[PDB]
Design a protein around this ligand. Sequence first.
Ligand code: ADP
Ligand code: ADP
Ligand code: ADP
Ligand code: ADP
Lengths: 399, 417, 426, 435, 111, 138
Amino acid sequence: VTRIERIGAHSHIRGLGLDDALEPRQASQGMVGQLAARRAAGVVLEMIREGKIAGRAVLIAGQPGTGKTAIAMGMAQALGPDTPFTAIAGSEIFSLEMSKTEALTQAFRRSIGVRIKEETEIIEGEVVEIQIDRPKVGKLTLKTTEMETIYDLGTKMIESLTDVITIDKATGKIQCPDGELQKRKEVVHTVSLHEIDVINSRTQGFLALFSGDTGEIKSEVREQINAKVAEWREEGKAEIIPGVLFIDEVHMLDIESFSFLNRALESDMAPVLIMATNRGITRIRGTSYQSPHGIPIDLLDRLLIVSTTPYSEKDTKQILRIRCEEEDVEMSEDAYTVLTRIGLETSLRYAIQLITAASLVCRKRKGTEVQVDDIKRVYSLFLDESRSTQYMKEYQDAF
Amino acid sequence: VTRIERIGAHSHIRGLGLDDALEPRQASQGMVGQLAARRAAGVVLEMIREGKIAGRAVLIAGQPGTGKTAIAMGMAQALTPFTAIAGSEIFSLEMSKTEALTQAFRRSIGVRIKEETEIIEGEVVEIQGKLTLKTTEMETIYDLGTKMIESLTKDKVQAGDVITIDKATGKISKLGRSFTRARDYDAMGSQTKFVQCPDGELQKRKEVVHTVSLHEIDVINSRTQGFLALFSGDTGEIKSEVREQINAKVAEWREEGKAEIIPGVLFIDEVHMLDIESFSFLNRALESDMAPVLIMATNRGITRIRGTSYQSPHGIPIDLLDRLLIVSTTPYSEKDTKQILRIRCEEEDVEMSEDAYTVLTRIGLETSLRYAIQLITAASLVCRKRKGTEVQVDDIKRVYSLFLDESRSTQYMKEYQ
Amino acid sequence: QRIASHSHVKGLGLDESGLAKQAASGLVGQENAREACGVIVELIKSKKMAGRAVLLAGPPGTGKTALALAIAQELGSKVPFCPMVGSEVYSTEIKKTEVLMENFRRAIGLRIKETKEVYEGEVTELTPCEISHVIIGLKTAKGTKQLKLDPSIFESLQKERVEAGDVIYIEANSGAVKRQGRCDTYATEFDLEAEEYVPLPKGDVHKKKEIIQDVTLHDLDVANARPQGGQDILSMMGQLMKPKKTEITDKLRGEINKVVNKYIDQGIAELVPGVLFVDEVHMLDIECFTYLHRALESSIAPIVIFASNRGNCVIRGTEDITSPHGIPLDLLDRVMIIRTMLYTPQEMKQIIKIRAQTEGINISEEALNHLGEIGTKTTLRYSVQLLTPANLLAKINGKDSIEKEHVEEISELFYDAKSSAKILAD
Amino acid sequence: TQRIASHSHVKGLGLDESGLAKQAASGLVGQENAREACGVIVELIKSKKMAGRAVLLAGPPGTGKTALALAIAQELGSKVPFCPMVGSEVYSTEIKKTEVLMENFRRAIGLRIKETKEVYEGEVTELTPCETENPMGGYGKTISHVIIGLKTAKGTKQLKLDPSIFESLQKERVEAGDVIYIEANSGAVKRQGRCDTYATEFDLEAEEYVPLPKGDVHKKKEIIQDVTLHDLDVANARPQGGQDILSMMGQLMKPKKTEITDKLRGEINKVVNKYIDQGIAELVPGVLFVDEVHMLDIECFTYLHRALESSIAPIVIFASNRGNCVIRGTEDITSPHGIPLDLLDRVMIIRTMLYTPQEMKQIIKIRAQTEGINISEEALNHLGEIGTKTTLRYSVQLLTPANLLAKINGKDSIEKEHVEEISELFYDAKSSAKI
Amino acid sequence: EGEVTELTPSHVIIGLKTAKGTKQLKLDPSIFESLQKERVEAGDVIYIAVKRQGRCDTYATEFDLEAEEYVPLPKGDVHKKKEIIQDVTLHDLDVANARPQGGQDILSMMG
Amino acid sequence: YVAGPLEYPSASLILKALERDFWKEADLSMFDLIGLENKITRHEAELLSKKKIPRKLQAPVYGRDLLRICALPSHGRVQWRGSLDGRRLMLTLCRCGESLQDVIDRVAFVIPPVVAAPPSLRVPRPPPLYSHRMRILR
Ligand SMILES: Nc1ncnc2c1ncn2[C@@H]1O[C@H](COP(=O)(O)OP(=O)(O)O)[C@@H](O)[C@H]1O
Ligand SMILES: Nc1ncnc2c1ncn2[C@@H]1O[C@H](COP(=O)(O)OP(=O)(O)O)[C@@H](O)[C@H]1O
Ligand SMILES: Nc1ncnc2c1ncn2[C@@H]1O[C@H](COP(=O)(O)OP(=O)(O)O)[C@@H](O)[C@H]1O
Ligand SMILES: Nc1ncnc2c1ncn2[C@@H]1O[C@H](COP(=O)(O)OP(=O)(O)O)[C@@H](O)[C@H]1O
């Protein structure tokens, strides 16, 4: 019953609420407000889907709690599978086994996909206790419900016959399956430029699933792989698909990372870099230069800014009702009004915390529907950030 | 034909042009001006050649572009191990500053080792239990022991192979058959290349001299030696293995004459960037017996010492300044500037007019000298574009208008982006 | 083609006389910097000088990187061109100086001329005689013969699991590989063996062709930084640090240079010095600038192009020393500085039109005027970025070209650095 | 190659029989009180009664602190180990500072280990005298003794060894005519190789023929091996013998100098004490001369003033050259000599005054003598005057270049003109400060 | 589990004997034991992915003094399947799949 | 717990991403690692014993063959192999605080923990397996 993907904060959103003409809606796909920002998100999503342009970046600015990451997650969901979406934070680049610049340029590798189609022949069959052990060509009783083929094979194939014997181009591999044994299966695999790492050394897929690999071989395995995958393109071998790289709280990047991104977005296979920041006028990390959003101007000019206005009472209560639908909480209109007030006063995330605590208290007191007294007792029990700040007068081990 | 090394920034100086009595000439081996600095360079070069003492350091001071690096490269070319490095090269992530600096010091010293061993070489006629080794002037049969029999099989020795075997049963099949190559018409193995049959006495003792630097500590560092001698090698370099073993072995070889040391020179360009730790280490390292002659270069005056808030002359501690012989250079004059520009034009295969030389010297006096050194080739290329046979004033003026100098660049920065 | 930020730049735009055209080869205006670029490109093509430096200094968004890419295109793929960034020097397993030296070495290339021939032959004819002499048969679609090989080739062959009816390639000097099947493996109707087959090769039994492989000194260094494999030294597992910490110059790089010079004198190899374009030079530390102004003085250093976007500021790693272009006066001198000037509104509109033509976007007259106005308002890059979503919305709304309404709407939707800072005061 | 170093004239403290100081103190001049303190501390070291004691050679630059340090070191002699270290060497990127300090302390301590082994060697003539079967059991064929006819260069001596060793004889290729290496207690046979007398010039083989042994068959080889405690630590640290250690990739990174206290102390100390009190070894504590001690971080001094508290710590000779300066690694914490005030209380300060101009002249003259170049009276006086003006170390460096200038000018002795010319060709930092 | 009665060999046809009965298992070569694991009289317990030589069979009467210690014949059937409800954390599986230590290929052991 | 291996499905062209055309890989004789099989003395000996061009031991084909076979042996070099060979107590410890005990017993007594859930190794599953990679792995 209980799955890994339990109910989360950004779980209610399951898409972007836009029309055919990218026209936002009042309430759809878990999206309530941010009409202009939602339309911008849809525009950039359609641009990414086009894939004809490369080396573009976008920044989602706005105050904390104004749907900054919600719009990004909605764009990711609307993008759907089959397109890489590397979601990371500004603190991930700070790795030890690899340099921050190398970590970033590898994250870029995780944002560009490539589809490859393989046409192979796979034979049917069933295990009937073939290839007995100790106790020549041998015997192979290949048979299917539709048609049977009782024939033998060489010595290097009788020892690999064994419930469903799915012989393929490899040295064999494992009710009787139906249909002709000879069947053409066209399988398509999508990798995020894994060739740079999957061909780094011997037994290197081990590294691809371990990250133990140190800084890749600069300008020796990344450019050759790019040239080879380009040769594949235009020849019917493979085609590359651009993904998205989402760096939440990008202000943690340093001047080095910004200077590297300045030119990383100027390549043929440069993915669309969407970013988000809550800080305003703040010193760029590693220096004392104060710039907006903590990002230098030479990079902010290379991207498009997307502002997210704050939510109102209507949008606040609508998002609260959407979260209720996501969860299993139910309350009365008076409770809705009280929660909307508390949220518009303090914050929306704190309001969601309070409504969760109120549903829990209701479940504890055997109640069926949360009421005003429940949320009041909750607010009394769980204090707010600003509320606790007022009580800081106690001087609890100051600096 | 273009080669690896070509005309560069310090290729015009073929050496430290000096007389027999260390009397600096006006300009002989491409170098001009800096008479006192040239004589000091010659004196320190003679000191290096003498090798009578150890642990001597010389500091080359002067303003930027005064030929300090030029004098250093001239001394190096006239000087025979030489190691040129910068303050940033010793800074290594996997090796502490002290370890890298010690490695550089030991690599700046050379050591010649004479090796004499008995060698037996000749064409193999037939084996077996016993060998029948042939040479141009004679042939001999040898009885093979168990070790020799095993080596004859682990390596596919056969008739015609020009084998070689010294003592310690160290057999070698250097190259393949001589005459039999005929019937190998189409394909020829990778290692099975052919050689001429040796001549002279079958068994002969050969004396060879092996030249290696004192940095051989890496060879005796780990189980595998040749591997670490190519890349960074080992980073530890335990003090024991360095001093108690290598130094004592070199001393014993010197006593018995098996080896002889030749102290080189360690040129650390731009020493001002070194940390106080490196200077404190040098203070002692220059006191050791097998210490090479150190040369430095710095463009700093009263500047802060990296790693501390203290300021001292040349940006280095006073503790070390009392251990160096400062050789300050003098800025070039009109005549010296014109002469070095003439030398640069002659080396770069560039012909310019007298008025062109005058304008170039005026520019090099109003601006840096390297600016004019670059304007030389720039105007040469402009003239080539115009298809002219000689560079005129128009070309140098066009280049001066195209490429900006530090002064004009800073003056035109009023935009402030 | 996935148009990039510098795709329309397919050249430098110099005429036969050397002067820079007003607008050609994708570039617009900037005649002085283009002339300097066309002079330094000839300097590079001369292949006689070494270590000469260049600095494409100028305000942001002036096309210094565009000029660098134009130089790279004009030079052609026959000479190496290493695009480099300052942040890349901050490696974790290699010291900054060593990364810089590796980039310098990569910026030098050499072409290896060689004439290799093959001796493809049939395995079914394998008939050794004496292990001392072996014979293999030849059967191709154009001829049939036989060859005689050294027993070493027979050993290297039997090392592989050769089988009757396979196609094996035998090089005249060394090496051998197997290709299974020659239109006989699928005939017997035996199932697959984890490998794909191939028909018999066409052409003569013995082939010879001229080979030219473009290899750079850094490849030689990396190859010589390992035991090359072979015996038990071939031990290689995951996490292997192929980009090893460092490699000494006197005994490893020196030997590479010596062998390259030897093979060049023999006429087998041909050197082709490349270019090292280091972008965001101001990001390098002072301990990097001090080694850079010395390494570029060597007789082997190639041409290095620099580009400093920001102006005078504190140098990295110093926190007290301030120099113009964020580069110390030591390295600033000896580097030819090429000042890049700002673009005029007409030049901005022309660049916008060229970008629209290259990317396929079609803009109207009034639309182009409005886009150029929005660009000169804040910066040209903002208009270049808005150009695409304008046509995207036009297509969404059913319009083929961009109009004033679409450009105005997309400008109001998104925001630029100036507009963002204006509203950020809240 | 003599390879004269910077300051090699120092040969010892040169103290009289009474312990006082003199001028011609075996190369080193002046510094009476300092050389007397050096004599006291070297007498302490020789006593080998106290441990973990530190001494500070505080003094302005040029006072020859390192000179007197090397002097006391030479006086100690090559018998006891002397490990010189500078504060910069403590900064290691692979091993922590305190562990490097402990390794240096271990190196400073010496240990002579003796080893006596009774071994028999010589050309073997194997023969088994047939003996009646085991008398306790039935009858048959047995061997009660095995006689080996070891023949040495001095003569022949048959040994009636135990019969159980016959397995070892058959194990190795011990045939009549080869040299074997017998062991008294163990008895294991290790064939050295055939005798050179049978090495016919026509036989091609090496490492198989060895010369006959010189001396009696019974040889009691006494060998002594002096290895510092750090050597034993390193030897017991890394493994040896199989265990797939032959790998290259995952094992070539030998720099695992990281060390723990459990192995360093404890078992090693106990086995050392067992060898000492048993008569197999003799402990030899040395000295650890640490110059530029002010260069160490406070994290180093805080470990030093704790390691010096141990009973096994050797004698340490600190030599600080700086004065009142902020301790490294601390936020503007000024302390005397750049050393925390807490560590200065645990060290004896040996003050060294500045050299008198007469002492400067003496030093210049003795350095010229060591170099092997004659200097005239006027030239020596000028050298002394310039050494009084600027730092003294500048004058001594003007000898070799002036000597070469004189030799090139056609004269032998260094005339005043030569030093005058060199003073203008080369000058000091005090004059170079005029930027 | 059971005393090894036969160890004749890639695939090894081992024979395990217990109080219930005897079964000749057609075990895979990957389980072939490297150490002593005597062909007879050795008590072994195997599960599918490593073998454990529990102890020597109860032959204490064969010799009066032997280095090997003995355990009684297992009374449980040779082939038995038991369901174990093991509690583990996700990070365990994560770090295990990160650097696995199972299998038998030489590359694994070298890694 | 014995967890199953994580199957990593991937395309086949991935494994063929760094393979270069056989008619484009030139013979790189720049490998200075030949100092593991050649000596400086033997290097000089080979240089001083190179067969001359005549080599007096279909006619034009044989001449071209002789020419190409004379070209290759001219290559000779060595860094160092002779200089390397020309230059060159395991006491018992308790490993713990116990007075005296066999180290084997020490290690055998205290072994509480076993791995939580070790699976087998990961295995890429490209339905096509190129002969080159499989041969190299074998
Ligand atoms: N328009 C909206 N529709 C639905 N849910 C929203 C909307 N805006 C915000 N939310 C929710 O309100 C909270 C806002 O937090 P978020 O915007 O993610 O903060 P930040 O972006 O600063 O990390 C999230 O739980 C988000 O899911
Ligand atoms: N006396 C001289 N003779 C020849 N060339 C000189 C001379 N002085 C300076 N140069 C030239 O000046 C250029 C730069 O000088 P540089 O050596 O960088 O000064 P610094 O010694 O301060 O580093 C060099 O390319 C060199 O060719
Ligand atoms: N002379 C020119 N003609 C046409 N387009 C130009 C010209 N110079 C710059 N551009 C455009 O302006 C943009 C500036 O990019 P870039 O060269 O990175 O600016 P910067 O000068 O900051 O490096 C480029 O994308 C390029 O397409
Ligand atoms: N008393 C002395 N007699 C002779 N030479 C001396 C004397 N004192 C110092 N020197 C000389 O001073 C030089 C260095 O002294 P040093 O021990 O390094 O002092 P510091 O370390 O304080 O500079 C040595 O080369 C030595 O020749």
